[PDB]
Amino acid sequence: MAQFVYTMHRVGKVVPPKRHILKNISLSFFPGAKIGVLGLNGAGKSTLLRIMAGIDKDIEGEARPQPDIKIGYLPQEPQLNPEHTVRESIEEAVSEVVNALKRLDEVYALYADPDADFDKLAAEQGRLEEIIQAHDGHNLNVQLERAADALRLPDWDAKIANLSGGERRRVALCRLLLEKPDMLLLDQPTNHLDAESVAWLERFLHDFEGTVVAITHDRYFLDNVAGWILELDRGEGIPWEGNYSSWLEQKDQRLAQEASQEAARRKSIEKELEWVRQGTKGRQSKGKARLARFEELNSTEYQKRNETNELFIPPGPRLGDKVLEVSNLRKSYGDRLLIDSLSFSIPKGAIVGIIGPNGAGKSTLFRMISGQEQPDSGTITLGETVKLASVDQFRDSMDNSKTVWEEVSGGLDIMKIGNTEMPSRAYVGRFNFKGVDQGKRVGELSGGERGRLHLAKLLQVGGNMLLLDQPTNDLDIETLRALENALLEFPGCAMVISHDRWFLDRIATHILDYQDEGKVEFFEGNFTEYEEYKKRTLGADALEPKRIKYKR
Amino acid sequence: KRMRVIREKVDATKQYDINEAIALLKELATAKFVESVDVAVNLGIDARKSDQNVRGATVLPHGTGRSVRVAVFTQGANAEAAKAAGAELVGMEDLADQIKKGEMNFDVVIASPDAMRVVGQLGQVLGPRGLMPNPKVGTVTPNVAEAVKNAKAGQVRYRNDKNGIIHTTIGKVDFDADKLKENLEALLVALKKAKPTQAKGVYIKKVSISTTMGAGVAVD
Amino acid sequence: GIREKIKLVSSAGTGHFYTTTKNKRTKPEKLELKKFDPVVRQHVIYKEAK
RNA sequence: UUGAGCCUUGAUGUGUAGGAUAGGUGGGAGGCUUUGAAGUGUGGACGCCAGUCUGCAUGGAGCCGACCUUGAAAUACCACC
Ligand SMILES: Nc1ncnc2c1ncn2[C@@H]1O[C@H](COP(=O)(O)OP(=O)(O)OP(=O)(O)O)[C@@H](O)[C@H]1O
Ligand SMILES: Nc1ncnc2c1ncn2[C@@H]1O[C@H](COP(=O)(O)OP(=O)(O)OP(=O)(O)O)[C@@H](O)[C@H]1O
Numbered sequence A: 001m002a003q004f005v006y007t008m009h010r011v012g013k014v015v016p017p018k019r020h021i022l023k024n025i026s027l028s029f030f031p032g033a034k035i036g037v038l039g040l041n042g043a044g045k046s047t048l049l050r051i052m053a054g055i056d057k058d059i060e061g062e063a064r065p066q067p068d069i070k071i072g073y074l075p076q077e078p079q080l081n082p083e084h085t086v087r088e089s090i091e092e093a094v095s096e097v098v099n100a101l102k103r104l105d106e107v108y109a110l111y112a113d114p115d116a117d118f119d120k121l122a123a124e125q126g127r128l129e130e131i132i133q134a135h136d137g138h139n140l141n142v143q144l145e146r147a148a149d150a151l152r153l154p155d156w157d158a159k160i161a162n163l164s165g166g167e168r169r170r171v172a173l174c175r176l177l178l179e180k181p182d183m184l185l186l187d188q189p190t191n192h193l194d195a196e197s198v199a200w201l202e203r204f205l206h207d208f209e210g211t212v213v214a215i216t217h218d219r220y221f222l223d224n225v226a227g228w229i230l231e232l233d234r235g236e237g238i239p240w241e242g243n244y245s246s247w248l249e250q251k252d253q254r255l256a257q258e259a260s261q262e263a264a265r266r267k268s269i270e271k272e273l274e275w276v277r278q279g280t281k282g283r284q285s286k287g288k289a290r291l292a293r294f295e296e297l298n299s300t301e302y303q304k305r306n307e308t309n310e311l312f313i314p315p316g317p318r319l320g321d322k323v324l325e326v327s328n329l330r331k332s333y334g335d336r337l338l339i340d341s342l343s344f345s346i347p348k349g350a351i352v353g354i355i356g357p358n359g360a361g362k363s364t365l366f367r368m369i370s371g372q373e374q375p376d377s378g379t380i381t382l383g384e385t386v387k388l389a390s391v392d393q394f395r396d397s398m399d400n401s402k403t404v405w406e407e408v409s410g411g412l413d414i415m416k417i418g419n420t421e422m423p424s425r426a427y428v429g430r431f432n433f434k435g436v437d438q439g440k441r442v443g444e445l446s447g448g449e450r451g452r453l454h455l456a457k458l459l460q461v462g463g464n465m466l467l468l469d470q471p472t473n474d475l476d477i478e479t480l481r482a483l484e485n486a487l488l489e490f491p492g493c494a495m496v497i498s499h500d501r502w503f504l505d506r507i508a509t510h511i512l513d514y515q516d517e518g519k520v521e522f523f524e525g526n527f528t529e530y531e532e533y534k535k536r537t538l539g540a541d542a543l544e545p546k547r548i549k550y551k552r
Numbered sequence B: 001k002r003m004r005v006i007r008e009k010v011d012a013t014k015q016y017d018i019n020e021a022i023a024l025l026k027e028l029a030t031a032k033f034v035e036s037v038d039v040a041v042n043l044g045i046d047a048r049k050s051d052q053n054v055r056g057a058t059v060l061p062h063g064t065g066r067s068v069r070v071a072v073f074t075q076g077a078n079a080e081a082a083k084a085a086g087a088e089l090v091g092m093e094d095l096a097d098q099i100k101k102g103e104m105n106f107d108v109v110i111a112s113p114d115a116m117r118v119v120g121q122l123g124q125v126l127g128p129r130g131l132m133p134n135p136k137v138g139t140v141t142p143n144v145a146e147a148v149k150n151a152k153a154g155q156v157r158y159r160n161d162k163n164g165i166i167h168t169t170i171g172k173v174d175f176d177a178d179k180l181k182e183n184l185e186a187l188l189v190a191l192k193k194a195k196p197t198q199a200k201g202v203y204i205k206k207v208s209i210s211t212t213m214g215a216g217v218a219v220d
Numbered sequence C: 001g002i003r004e005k006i007k008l009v010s011s012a013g014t015g016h017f018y019t020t021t022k023n024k025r026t027k028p029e030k031l032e033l034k035k036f037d038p039v040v041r042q043h044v045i046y047k048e049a050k
Numbered sequence D: 001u002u003g004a005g006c007c008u009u010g011a012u013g014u015g016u017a018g019g020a021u022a023g024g025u026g027g028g029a030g031g032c033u034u035u036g037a038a039g040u041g042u043g044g045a046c047g048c049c050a051g052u053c054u055g056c057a058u059g060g061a062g063c064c065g066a067c068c069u070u071g072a073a074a075u076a077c078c079a080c081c
């Protein structure tokens, strides 16, 4: 509290044209502080974290850490090379000690042979001693084993490309945490993680010693890990002390006050306009000073914007009473099997929430359902009146080299969505992408806008069978409620995979819960009465965690 | 009991000098043991930085008071030299693995000037315990018979802690205080010669003089 | 005026730079061209910077 | 009545396996208690809940080292924490 671990004095940032993502930000973070970073999508939280981590440099103002603290930055989406396995990916982050052991082999060669035995070896071994002493050195195997067991990492020899999403994010988290930092900046740490891993992560962060700055959209995780909240409304960060519940009321009151002040400013502007339009009435003044003071009163106002509250899911073709029936489904990859002895039939106008632990067959189910894999048993019969639209976890297919118009529309001013046709500009603007925004490069974009454009790109086939694979990844709560509304008037059928119990509680009509040993429970109803069914077939047990450690 | 007595007997809130309490420490012969010396050294220096780690050896006129055993686990004639000049046991390169697995104990590190078919276990077997002969510290040298000085000088491994703490023996208290002085000067000389380039504040912070069950009086 | 001024630093290690403009909206990529460096009298690749 | 220090003094630190809450190298072997037990009650804080730490009592004395079945070893003062 006496000193600070990071400081920023009047840090501004300008994007193309003239928009101030950040301006006049003067904040200092003390050691032992945990800070949440709330705000709308597009506010600039990721930009601020990049500036804090040092990758972003072209700014205005001062930004400074203390002169030796170790910084660990986790971005919006990590980049991994698919060729590596888990062991190779981890050894890429602990390469230096492995290199030191290889140099031990080299030195043992030079010392077993009388050439270069002492003349060019003693001064060279300074680093060889230093790396092994500073790090764990020969303790690397056991420390890595303990870390993998504590994170529940996948097997050491699994290909990254064949790894799932949650496992991929866990591998990225391990690579981050091996290089023990003191400053810890995380951009949506709980993105593809399940409840168990989220609980472990929040407990670890609460028990942490250094300082943490986390971009969050989960109120519960924020309230369980953070001490205070940065806001970043529009170029202005508002450090608020307290919890989420009070900050919500503070934000609503602030918005109401700004609305009132804007209305008063409009009143004054129109009154002074009605004065300006008057005459002179003789050889009198008309008041050049008043004229200048009126012209100064056009300081412009930034509309809150983003604030998505409506989404467009196009209508599909008329759907019959045989939608999807699977009978005796079975799948395995080698010895480990995902699904076995699974069967169900889906009626009309249903939303099916699919839940389970990380890496359990949820995405493989969709790959089967839409012609991409092959079950070990078979008999996944679709209907004859079914048109399928799919949305997957990773936004990798599209290229980061096209504007939003050229990507979604394909360069055509008319867009025939299913049956009818709509102008491409209007269709893309229905997803909160106005005329100015329709020129932005996809690589020059935010995470939430990336997800929105993914949805708008793949929902244009007009089919009445939605297969959504975690579409609530990096969407703010306003767009989340927009999707919650838009998913209820859509007359077709939807199957949504999501780890957000609160999101699925609103819209789920059927449940697909995964369990151990390849059990895929099918239940009819929402979570509220699913809990009652469980309490009818009740089993009581509360010993959930282990919560061990990372290192000794 | 007498531990509670020495609690009040030592008042380390007050600063002494380099030899102001040697008599008061010799007054701690009441404890039933041979009461070896385990002086502790703390400096003003960072130790997390990788480059500032210190490792080496030194000598003292009276010896450490312990029998340093540096077995000749080498090839050639270093084992023969040690067998008459201070070799705990002779181990050929075709038997070093067995000689380590069975009885690898030794007061000092192993000896291998040129017969170095393996550094030892490749996995901290020969380097984890600190048995790797590092010429940069002083373990390696071109003198075959010079390894006798390892047992004839009480050369000590300059182990480094995560907070730069050095614990070393000074020729157990059987040697008089006027003999402890000529070891104190030597250890300070070696400590200055082991100074890192990156320094700040005061180059030495605090030294604690004590015995095994004794109390740590400040040096200042 | 939507184009902002940018400078093409010299990668030859010397301090020398040209100055041009670039629409950071349509082209967010980093420019690089082989231009002339009078300090070294050789053609070296210049990369953009603030 | 309180905050921030700053010196001490205690108290704490539970991956898989081994005796089992099992921090960094000591220096090293036995110190320790009987100034009254290993145990049985007895109030508190922690807990990952098996326990250690402790006020506590008519009563009251051998526990741990010693042997490593481990990546690391035996809650054995003081260590500059
Ligand atoms: N070259 C650019 N042209 C236009 N806008 C840009 C450009 N570069 C960045 N931006 C804007 O910067 C804003 C900051 O987004 P950023 O990636 O920092 O994440 P964010 O606003 O915190 O949200 P999230 O990561 O949750 O989506 C984005 O809304 C984006 O539109
Ligand atoms: N082609 C493949 N080869 C080998 N293993 C595979 C292959 N496809 C999938 N797997 C394995 O099956 C699982 C696939 O992940 P899955 O789609 O079940 O994700 P999930 O963990 O259920 O969900 P989430 O996407 O939310 O992380 C992983 O365990 C992965 O190792």
Ligand code: NA
Pocket: A045, A046, A047, A049, A075, A076, A187
């Ligand atoms: Na980011």
Ligand code: NA
Pocket: A164, A165, A362, A363, A393
């Ligand atoms: Na998946």
